[PDB]
Design an enzyme around this catalytic site. Structure first.
Site, short mmCIF file in Angstrom:
data_model
loop_
_atom_site.label_atom_id
_atom_site.label_comp_id
_atom_site.label_asym_id
_atom_site.label_seq_id
_atom_site.Cartn_x
_atom_site.Cartn_y
_atom_site.Cartn_z
N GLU A 36 0.82 -1.21 0.00
CA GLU A 36 0.00 0.00 0.00
C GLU A 36 0.85 1.26 0.00
O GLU A 36 0.55 2.21 -0.74
CB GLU A 36 -0.94 0.04 1.21
N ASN A 47 -7.55 10.55 -5.15
CA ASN A 47 -8.28 9.92 -6.24
C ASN A 47 -9.18 10.90 -6.99
O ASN A 47 -9.62 11.91 -6.45
CB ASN A 47 -9.15 8.80 -5.66
N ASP A 49 -11.94 10.41 -8.06
CA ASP A 49 -13.29 10.39 -7.52
C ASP A 49 -13.49 11.34 -6.33
O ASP A 49 -14.61 11.45 -5.84
CB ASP A 49 -13.76 8.97 -7.18
N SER A 51 -12.16 11.25 -3.17
CA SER A 51 -11.65 10.61 -1.97
C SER A 51 -10.13 10.52 -2.05
O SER A 51 -9.53 10.66 -3.11
CB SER A 51 -12.24 9.21 -1.80
N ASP A 53 -6.66 8.32 -0.13
CA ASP A 53 -6.14 7.23 0.68
C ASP A 53 -4.99 7.77 1.51
O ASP A 53 -4.10 8.46 0.98
CB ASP A 53 -5.65 6.10 -0.22
N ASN A 60 -9.14 4.94 3.19
CA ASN A 60 -9.86 5.86 2.32
C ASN A 60 -10.86 6.75 3.07
O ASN A 60 -11.53 6.34 4.02
CB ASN A 60 -10.58 5.03 1.25
#
Length: 130
Positions: A36, A47, A49, A51, A53, A60
């Site tokens: 990760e 992201n 979108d 969001s 991480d 997230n």
């Protein structure tokens, strides 16, 4: 900032109870962090979108932590996403536990599903003082 070593992270995760937590032996968690974030406590992936991480386990901001900019926020870990960027792993471990406690497997972590599941995950803790 901080970038962990494998065995240093294993020991910290074990002090936080992750070895066999909800059926996941310790190497699963170390492997997940490796792929990760490459053990970087400040890793941050933003992201398209909307969001993001955060941290060593790339948790997230839609379901899990609050960053105030993500649509549909649930903040189920009840933490600011900043807490996931700490050099100490407290918030990341407690939120990782909550993810599994809310009915998700480790399959919540794309890197675990894609790089760790089914492999000899014990190798990630081999040779470590625990």
């Amino acid at each position: 900032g901080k970038v962990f070593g494998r065995c240093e992270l294993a020991a910290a995760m074990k002090r936080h109870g992750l070895d066999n937590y909800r059926g996941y032996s310790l190497g699963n968690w170390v492997c997940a962090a490796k792929f990760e974030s490459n053990f970087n406590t400040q890793a941050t992936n933003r992201n398209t979108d909307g969001s993001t991480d955060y941290g060593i386990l790339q948790i997230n901001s839609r379901w899990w932590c609050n960053d105030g900019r993500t649509p549909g926020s649930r903040n189920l870990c009840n933490i600011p996403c900043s807490a996931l960027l700490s050099s100490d792993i407290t918030a990341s471990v407690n939120c990782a536990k909550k993810i599994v406690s809310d009915g998700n497997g480790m399959n919540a972590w794309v890197a675990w599903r894609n790089r760790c599941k089914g492999t000899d995950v014990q190798a990630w803790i081999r040779g470590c003082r625990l």
